[PDB]
From Swiss-Prot:
Family: Belongs to the peptidase A1 family.
Taxonomic placement: Eukaryota, Fungi, Dikarya, Ascomycota, Pezizomycotina
Disulfide pairings: C255-C290
EC number: 3.4.23.22
Protein name according to UniProt: Endothiapepsin
Gene from which the chain derives: EAPA
UniProt-annotated catalytic positions: D35, S199
Lineage top rank: taxon: Eukaryota
UniProt organism field: Cryphonectria parasitica
Amino acid sequence: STGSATTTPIDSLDDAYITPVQIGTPAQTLNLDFDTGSSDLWVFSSETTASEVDGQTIYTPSKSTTAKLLSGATWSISYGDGSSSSGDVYTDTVSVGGLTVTGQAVESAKKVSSSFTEDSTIDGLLGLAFSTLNTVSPTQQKTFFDNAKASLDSPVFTADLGYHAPGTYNFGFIDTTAYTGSITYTAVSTKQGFWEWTSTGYAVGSGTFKSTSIDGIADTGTTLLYLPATVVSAYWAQVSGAKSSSSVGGYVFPCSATLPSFTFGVGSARIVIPGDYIDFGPISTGSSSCFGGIQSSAGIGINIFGDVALKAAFVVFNGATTPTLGFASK
């Protein structure tokens, strides 16, 4: 089997992407944030504290003839950005772009943190990291991909995120029309439960490529590109007036600037992030100070190849017995 679904930016900055997901019988369609940095499929629901729901579409398990309470199961998750959610668990039928899993754990939120409430466009998350990170207790549950894998034509999914435009998540096949040149594959460590890999280096603008190993995670659920302070300083030094602002929480730059591109290495291959992908707009409405899309990972504890990086590529998440990651230009 295969599936193919369009993913759409939630706003004009590409702060996140939502993908429609069918849950239950009859189908209830929710728009979920596909997140290769976590492993829980959780939704706003009829059980979510009412004051914490503000415009989201909810899953109502009592209206699904295929929903079953997973007795005794609870979940609770905290994300790198400080947000969180928790609740109980159902199993139900879940379909993405025509690919159906029966008996998928659907984690129903009883509580969500303010950042989730405040974002009306995201009805929940669909985790695509390794199932070892799943938070369901006392019996850990499998991700949608893990459950689908054996049925897929090939045990892969691909992320093709757009810049200020829709893109595609495919399951079970590689669309050879969706990228240019070849896909370069690189090793993955699953030791931390992430799609963790090592970039071979970087360049700023038309500058020379610096060969250096950068361990990090391919994370569709993180907006920005978080890299070591040395790398990030080298980038922003090429932007007149750019500075790190403790009050704002990272590098800012004059909105009048033209940003240089940023290149990262995948083996001997190179992925070029155009400068405009690195512009996250005014820090507050009407400001002429703009927020940068490349930020320091210092004090995160891990480098993160988030949407800024991934949207410059066609990305293969290869879930073979030994997982790997592939990147192509597009």
